C-alpha cells in the first residue's frame, strides 16, 4: 500500500521531512491529482497547499533565543530566526511556489534556474550575488527522477552555497527520485507533501498529478 | 511549569487540540507578544498565525472517502469534505480571523456577535439564516475568563446549533479559560495556538499579548 | 436615462467624485447587481471594486512635492503623501472595505461605528464604537457601501465631528447611492468629500435603491 | 518640456494608453524610483501599481451589452466580457506583473517567452518558450514592465504572429517606456495596443530609460 512506501523513506532517509498526512491535506491532494477539476481550482488548492509547505519548510532554518517583554510588562522565552536566506526556483515548475514564499517571507530575494534536457543542461539563470552566504530554499514541485534538481544543486555548489544549507521544498516525489538526490548529495534537506509508488513508462509520477507547470499555468 | 499546564489540559480536556509547538510557531508568537512590534508588523504576523489556525481547525470537520483518477489513468484514493460551514466572529477581536478563514474558504458565510459587559450581554448579532444546520467556526483570539465565548455559545445553542458542531478557533488561552467552556459546553471542540500560565488582577492573560483587539486595529 | 442623473449631481455637488464609468467598471457592477451570481462570485467582484474605489479615494488627500534620486543618478520631480489617516466603517456594511483599505495602506488604523435605526421611531441611534485615540488629528475614510436615505451616514459623521475630526477632513467612500442620500449629506455637512462608483435614480416603497443591488451586507457576508 | 514629449507620442501613436497621472500614481512612481528604498517597499508599491495597470488594460477588450435582474426584481442594462485571453510574460521582468494579472483574472493562462540579445550580434533571439496551444484564438496581454529600445518586445510580438496571433488582439501592458521604444513597436506592428503608466524622455548608452528606475527585474527579485 501507501504506508509501506512512506515509512521506508522515513526510516532510510533522515534529512527528508514528510508533512503530517492530515485529512485536509489528502483532500487538497485529491482535488489537484484529479484530472477533472478546472484550472481555477487547481491553482487555488495548489497555492493553498504550497503555502502550507513553505511554513513547514521555514522550520528547518536555524533559530536563536530571544527574550521579550509583554505589554503586561512580563517576559517571555521567545525564539528568533536570523540567517540570510533566498528562494531559488527551477524555471516554470518552481515559479509556482515563488508567490507562496513572498507571502510569508516578504521582499525575499528570488533566484531562477532553467534546467533544460535536449544530460540535463543549464540555460538561463539569475541568482543573488551573495547566494553563497545564505541558506537556499530549492523550489521544485515534482521530483520524478531527480535529474534537474540534481543539476540545480550541482550548479549551486559550484557557485559556493553549502550543501548542508540547501532545503529542497517539494510537493510530489518518487522513491527513486528521493534516493538519487540523497545519494548524489546527502546533507541536504528535503520537505515534501507526498511520495508516490513509482515512475511511468515515461518519466511521470504514479499515481501522480500529471505535468504541474502545464496544469498550473494553463498549457 | 509551562510544560505541566499543557499536560493537565491535555489529559483532562481531550477535546482541546493544541497546534504543534514548532520553532516557527514560537517565532511568530514571540513577535506578536513583544510590545515593541509596530502596527504593520503586528498584523502581518498575526495574519500568518491565524492562517495556520483556520487550517488546523478545518481538520475537525467530517470527511468521506472519494476516488478520482490522475491524468495517467490510474486511480487515487482521496477524501473530501461536505457538511457546509460558516464562521461566527465575536465582534472586533474575532473579526481579525475572518480574512484568514475566507482565504482558505472562499465566500464561506460569515456571522457576527457583539457581546458587551453590562455580566456579558448580547448587543447585536447577524448570523446566517441557515446556521442551525451547519458546522460553526467560532472566532475569538483571546480566551481569558471565557465569559464572552460562553455567552456566544448559549446564543448559538438557543438558535438550534448542535453543541458538538462548534469548533472554537482561539489564539491564546488561559487554564481557567478552558475549564469554563468545557464545563458549560463539554461537547464543543477547541483549537488554540498557545496556552498560557495565568490571569492577573485585571483579568488579562499573562504573559499574554495584551489587548489583541486594539493592537490589531488602532489601539 | 442614467446620464441625465449622473450629470445633475456632478453639477449640483462639485464635492462628490464619481468614478470613471468604464467597461470594466460597468461590467463588475452588473455582475454584483445580478441577483443570480453566487455568493463566492459576488465577493470576488466586490473586493475587486472595493479596491478600485479606495485607490480613487486616496487622491483626495493632500500631497507635497518630493524630489528623488534614481539609480541612473538623476533627480525625479515627484510628490508624496503625508497626513496620517484612518478608516472608519459603519458596522457590518463598511467592514467589507477594511481589508481593501488595508491592502493599499499596510496596517492602517481602522475604527468601527455601529449605528442602529430604532424599532419604533426609526431613529438613527449609536450602539457601539471604537475609533483611534487621536482620530481628530487624522483624515478619515468613512466606509459604507450603500447610501439611500443617508440617515446612518449623517449620524456617523455627527459622532466624528463631536470628537474633533474636521468635516472637510472626512472622505466618504461609497459604492452605490441614490440622489436623495447625497443631497442630504451635502446639505447637512457641506465640506465632506464623497467618492462613489455609481448613483442610481430613486428608492422603492422599502427605501431600497432600486436599480440597486439589494442588501450589500447580507450579499457580501452571505448570512 | 515633459508635456511636450507625452503630447507628441499621444497624437502620433493613437494606440498608446497613457494611464491617468493621478497624484497617487505620481506618488507610487516616486517611491519605486528611489534608489534609496528597500526591496520589500519596492515590491509592495510595484505590485500595487501593476494591479492598477492591468485593470486599465482589461478595458482594451471587447464587451457586449447584457441585462440582468436585481434582487429588487428589476432589470439592469450592463455589459459583459468574453473573448478568451491569456498572458505572455517575457522571462523575469514580465513575470513580476503575472500575479497581478491573476489577482483580477483568476485561473488565467500564462505563457512565458525568454528572449535574449546575442553574444556578439547583440540582436534579440528566442531561447525558451511555453505558450497556450490555443493562443491563436485568444487575446494576448503581453507583459513587460520596460520598453527601452523595444528589441525584446518586438522579438516577442514576432513569435506570437508566427503562431497565428492577430496583431490587434495584442495588448502590450507596460509601466515605464522610452519614446524610441514606442516608435519601434508602432513601426513594425501598428495594430498592437499599448497601455503604459509612464513615458520618460530618453535612453542612455547602457540602454536604460534615463530618469527611469534602473533594472526593474534586478530590483524586483533582489538579484543586484
Ligand atoms: O525593450 P528593450 O530595449 O529590450 O528594453 C527593456 C527590456 O530589457 C530589460 O531586461 P534586463 O536585461 O535588464 O534583464 P532581467 O530584467 O530579466 O534581469 C527589461 O526588463 C525589458 O525586458
Ligand atoms: O511536471 C512534472 C515533471 C515530471 N514528472 C511529473 O510527474 N510531473
Ligand atoms: O487578555 C485579554 C483578555 C481579553 N481580551 C484581550 O484582548 N486580552
Ligand atoms: O438598497 C439598500 C439601501 C440601504 N442599505 C442596503 O444595504 N441596501
Ligand atoms: O529601462 C531599463 C533598461 C534596462 N533594463 C531594465 O530593466 N530597464
Ligand atoms: Mg528581464
Coordinates of N, CA and C in Angstrom, one line a residue, chain B residues 61-181:
Chain B
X61 N -13.4 19.0 10.9 CA -14.6 18.7 10.1 C -14.7 17.3 9.6
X62 N -15.9 16.8 9.5 CA -16.1 15.4 9.0 C -15.9 15.4 7.5
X63 N -15.3 14.2 7.0 CA -15.0 14.0 5.6 C -15.2 12.6 5.2
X64 N -15.4 12.3 3.9 CA -15.6 11.0 3.4 C -14.7 10.5 2.3
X65 N -14.7 9.2 2.0 CA -13.8 8.7 1.0 C -14.2 9.2 -0.4
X66 N -13.2 9.5 -1.2 CA -13.5 9.9 -2.6 C -12.4 9.4 -3.5
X67 N -12.8 8.9 -4.7 CA -11.8 8.4 -5.6 C -11.8 9.3 -6.8
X68 N -10.7 9.4 -7.5 CA -10.6 10.2 -8.7 C -9.4 9.5 -9.5
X69 N -9.2 10.0 -10.7 CA -8.2 9.4 -11.5 C -7.2 10.5 -11.9
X70 N -5.9 10.2 -11.8 CA -4.9 11.1 -12.2 C -4.8 11.2 -13.7
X71 N -4.2 12.2 -14.3 CA -4.0 12.3 -15.8 C -3.2 11.2 -16.4
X72 N -3.0 10.1 -15.6 CA -2.3 9.0 -16.1 C -3.2 7.7 -16.2
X73 N -4.4 8.0 -15.9 CA -5.5 7.0 -15.9 C -5.3 6.0 -14.8
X74 N -4.6 6.3 -13.8 CA -4.5 5.5 -12.6 C -5.3 6.2 -11.5
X75 N -6.1 5.4 -10.8 CA -7.0 5.9 -9.8 C -6.2 6.2 -8.5
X76 N -6.8 7.1 -7.7 CA -6.3 7.6 -6.5 C -7.3 7.6 -5.4
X77 N -7.0 7.1 -4.2 CA -7.9 7.1 -3.1 C -7.7 8.3 -2.2
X78 N -8.6 9.3 -2.3 CA -8.5 10.5 -1.5 C -9.7 10.7 -0.7
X79 N -9.9 12.0 -0.2 CA -11.1 12.3 0.7 C -11.7 13.6 0.3
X80 N -12.8 14.0 0.9 CA -13.4 15.2 0.6 C -14.3 15.7 1.7
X81 N -14.6 16.9 1.8 CA -15.4 17.5 2.9 C -16.7 18.0 2.4
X82 N -17.7 17.7 3.1 CA -19.1 18.1 2.8 C -19.6 18.9 4.0
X83 N -20.9 18.7 4.4 CA -21.5 19.4 5.5 C -21.0 20.8 5.6
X84 N -21.7 21.7 4.9 CA -21.3 23.1 4.9 C -21.1 23.7 6.3
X85 N -20.3 24.8 6.3 CA -19.9 25.5 7.4 C -20.3 27.0 7.4
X86 N -19.7 27.8 8.2 CA -19.9 29.2 8.4 C -18.9 29.7 9.4
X87 N -18.8 31.0 9.5 CA -17.8 31.5 10.5 C -18.5 32.5 11.4
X88 N -18.5 32.3 12.7 CA -19.0 33.3 13.7 C -17.9 34.0 14.4
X89 N -17.8 35.3 14.3 CA -16.8 36.1 14.9 C -17.3 37.0 16.0
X90 N -16.7 36.9 17.2 CA -17.0 37.8 18.3 C -16.5 39.2 18.0
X91 N -17.4 40.1 17.7 CA -17.0 41.4 17.2 C -15.8 42.2 17.7
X92 N -15.0 42.5 16.7 CA -13.8 43.2 16.7 C -12.6 42.3 16.9
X93 N -12.6 41.5 18.0 CA -11.5 40.6 18.2 C -11.4 39.5 17.2
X94 N -12.5 38.8 17.1 CA -12.5 37.7 16.1 C -12.6 38.2 14.7
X95 N -13.0 39.4 14.4 CA -13.1 39.9 13.0 C -11.8 39.8 12.3
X96 N -10.7 39.8 13.1 CA -9.3 39.7 12.6 C -9.1 38.3 12.0
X97 N -9.9 37.3 12.3 CA -9.7 36.0 11.8 C -10.6 35.7 10.6
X98 N -11.5 36.6 10.3 CA -12.4 36.4 9.1 C -11.6 36.3 7.8
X99 N -10.7 37.3 7.6 CA -9.9 37.3 6.4 C -9.1 36.0 6.2
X100 N -8.8 35.4 7.3 CA -8.0 34.1 7.1 C -8.8 33.0 6.7
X101 N -10.0 32.9 7.3 CA -11.0 31.9 7.0 C -11.4 31.9 5.6
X102 N -11.8 33.1 5.1 CA -12.1 33.3 3.7 C -11.0 33.3 2.7
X103 N -9.8 33.0 3.2 CA -8.6 32.8 2.4 C -8.4 31.4 2.1
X104 N -9.1 30.5 2.9 CA -9.0 29.1 2.7 C -10.4 28.5 2.4
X105 N -11.4 29.4 2.7 CA -12.8 29.0 2.5 C -13.5 30.1 1.7
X106 N -13.1 30.3 0.5 CA -13.7 31.3 -0.4 C -15.2 31.5 -0.2
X107 N -15.6 32.7 0.0 CA -17.0 33.0 0.2 C -17.8 32.3 1.2
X108 N -17.1 31.7 2.2 CA -17.8 31.0 3.3 C -18.7 32.0 3.9
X109 N -19.8 31.6 4.5 CA -20.7 32.5 5.2 C -20.2 33.0 6.5
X110 N -20.4 34.3 6.7 CA -19.9 34.9 8.0 C -21.0 35.5 8.9
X111 N -20.8 35.2 10.2 CA -21.7 35.7 11.2 C -21.0 36.6 12.2
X112 N -21.7 37.5 12.9 CA -21.1 38.4 13.9 C -21.9 38.6 15.1
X113 N -21.3 38.4 16.3 CA -21.9 38.6 17.6 C -21.2 39.6 18.4
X114 N -21.9 40.7 18.8 CA -21.3 41.7 19.6 C -21.7 41.6 21.1
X115 N -20.9 41.0 21.9 CA -21.3 40.8 23.3 C -20.5 41.9 24.1
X116 N -21.3 42.5 25.0 CA -20.7 43.6 25.8 C -21.0 43.4 27.3
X117 N -20.1 43.9 28.1 CA -20.2 43.8 29.6 C -21.3 44.8 29.9
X118 N -22.2 44.5 30.9 CA -23.3 45.4 31.3 C -22.8 46.6 32.1
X119 N -21.5 41.2 33.8 CA -22.3 40.2 33.2 C -22.3 40.4 31.6
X120 N -21.6 39.6 30.9 CA -21.5 39.7 29.4 C -23.0 39.8 28.9
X121 N -23.2 40.6 27.9 CA -24.6 40.6 27.4 C -24.6 40.8 25.9
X122 N -25.6 40.1 25.2 CA -25.7 40.3 23.8 C -26.1 41.7 23.5
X123 N -25.6 42.3 22.4 CA -25.9 43.6 22.0 C -26.4 43.7 20.6
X124 N -25.8 42.9 19.7 CA -26.1 42.9 18.3 C -25.6 41.6 17.7
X125 N -26.3 41.1 16.7 CA -25.8 39.9 16.1 C -26.6 39.6 14.8
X126 N -25.8 39.2 13.7 CA -26.3 38.8 12.4 C -25.7 37.5 11.9
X127 N -26.4 36.4 12.1 CA -26.0 35.1 11.8 C -26.7 34.6 10.5
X128 N -26.1 33.6 9.8 CA -26.8 33.1 8.6 C -28.1 32.5 9.0
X129 N -29.1 32.7 8.1 CA -30.5 32.2 8.4 C -30.4 30.7 8.6
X130 N -29.5 30.1 7.9 CA -29.2 28.6 7.8 C -28.7 28.1 9.2
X131 N -27.5 28.7 9.6 CA -26.8 28.4 10.8 C -27.1 27.1 11.5
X132 N -28.3 27.0 12.1 CA -28.7 25.8 12.9 C -28.4 24.5 12.2
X133 N -28.1 24.5 10.9 CA -27.9 23.3 10.2 C -26.4 23.2 9.8
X134 N -25.5 24.0 10.3 CA -24.2 24.0 9.9 C -23.1 23.8 11.0
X135 N -21.9 23.5 10.5 CA -20.8 23.4 11.5 C -20.3 24.9 11.7
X136 N -20.0 25.2 13.0 CA -19.6 26.6 13.2 C -18.2 26.8 13.8
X137 N -17.4 27.6 13.0 CA -16.1 28.0 13.3 C -16.2 29.3 14.1
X138 N -16.1 29.2 15.4 CA -16.2 30.3 16.3 C -14.9 31.1 16.5
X139 N -14.8 32.3 16.0 CA -13.6 33.1 16.1 C -13.5 34.1 17.3
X140 N -12.4 33.9 18.1 CA -12.1 34.7 19.2 C -10.7 34.5 19.7
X141 N -9.8 35.4 19.3 CA -8.3 35.5 19.6 C -7.9 35.2 21.1
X142 N -8.6 35.8 22.0 CA -8.4 35.7 23.4 C -9.4 35.0 24.2
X143 N -9.0 34.2 25.1 CA -9.9 33.4 25.9 C -9.4 33.4 27.4
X144 N -9.7 34.5 28.1 CA -9.3 34.6 29.5 C -10.3 33.9 30.5
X145 N -11.4 34.6 30.6 CA -12.4 34.0 31.5 C -13.4 33.3 30.8
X146 N -13.4 33.3 29.4 CA -14.3 32.6 28.6 C -15.7 33.1 28.8
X147 N -15.8 34.2 29.5 CA -17.2 34.8 29.8 C -17.9 35.2 28.5
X148 N -17.2 35.8 27.5 CA -17.8 36.2 26.3 C -18.1 35.0 25.3
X149 N -17.1 34.0 25.2 CA -17.3 32.9 24.4 C -18.5 32.0 24.9
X150 N -18.7 32.0 26.2 CA -19.8 31.2 26.7 C -21.1 31.9 26.3
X151 N -21.2 33.2 26.4 CA -22.4 33.9 26.0 C -22.6 33.7 24.5
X152 N -21.5 33.6 23.8 CA -21.6 33.4 22.4 C -22.1 32.0 22.0
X153 N -21.9 31.0 22.9 CA -22.4 29.7 22.7 C -23.8 29.5 23.1
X154 N -24.2 30.1 24.3 CA -25.5 30.0 24.7 C -26.5 30.7 23.8
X155 N -26.0 31.5 22.9 CA -26.8 32.2 21.9 C -27.0 31.4 20.6
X156 N -25.9 30.7 20.3 CA -25.9 29.9 19.1 C -26.8 28.6 19.4
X157 N -26.6 28.1 20.6 CA -27.3 27.0 21.0 C -28.8 27.3 21.1
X158 N -29.2 28.5 21.4 CA -30.6 29.0 21.5 C -31.1 29.1 20.1
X159 N -30.3 29.0 19.1 CA -30.7 29.1 17.7 C -30.7 27.7 17.0
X160 N -30.6 26.7 17.8 CA -30.6 25.3 17.3 C -29.3 24.8 16.7
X161 N -28.2 25.4 17.1 CA -26.9 24.8 16.6 C -26.5 23.7 17.5
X162 N -26.0 22.6 16.9 CA -25.6 21.5 17.7 C -24.3 21.8 18.4
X163 N -24.2 21.5 19.7 CA -23.1 21.8 20.5 C -21.8 21.2 19.9
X164 N -21.8 19.8 19.7 CA -20.7 19.1 19.1 C -20.3 19.6 17.7
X165 N -21.1 20.5 17.2 CA -20.8 21.1 15.9 C -20.2 22.5 15.9
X166 N -19.6 22.8 17.0 CA -19.0 24.2 17.2 C -17.5 24.1 17.4
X167 N -16.7 24.5 16.4 CA -15.3 24.5 16.5 C -14.8 25.9 16.9
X168 N -14.3 26.0 18.2 CA -13.8 27.3 18.7 C -12.4 27.5 18.3
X169 N -12.2 28.5 17.4 CA -10.9 28.9 17.0 C -10.3 30.0 17.9
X170 N -9.2 29.7 18.6 CA -8.5 30.6 19.5 C -7.0 30.7 19.3
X171 N -6.5 31.9 19.7 CA -5.0 32.1 19.6 C -4.4 31.8 20.9
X172 N -4.7 32.6 21.9 CA -4.2 32.5 23.3 C -5.3 32.1 24.3
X173 N -5.0 31.1 25.1 CA -6.0 30.7 26.2 C -5.3 30.6 27.5
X174 N -6.1 30.8 28.6 CA -5.7 30.7 30.0 C -6.3 29.5 30.6
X175 N -5.6 28.7 31.4 CA -6.1 27.5 32.0 C -7.5 27.6 32.5
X176 N -7.8 28.6 33.3 CA -9.2 28.7 33.8 C -10.2 29.0 32.7
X177 N -9.7 29.5 31.6 CA -10.5 29.8 30.4 C -11.0 28.6 29.8
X178 N -10.2 27.6 29.7 CA -10.5 26.3 29.2 C -11.6 25.6 30.1
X179 N -11.2 25.3 31.4 CA -12.1 24.7 32.3 C -13.5 25.2 32.3
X180 N -13.7 26.5 31.9 CA -15.0 27.1 31.9 C -15.9 26.6 30.7
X181 N -15.3 26.8 29.5 CA -16.1 26.4 28.3 C -16.4 24.9 28.4

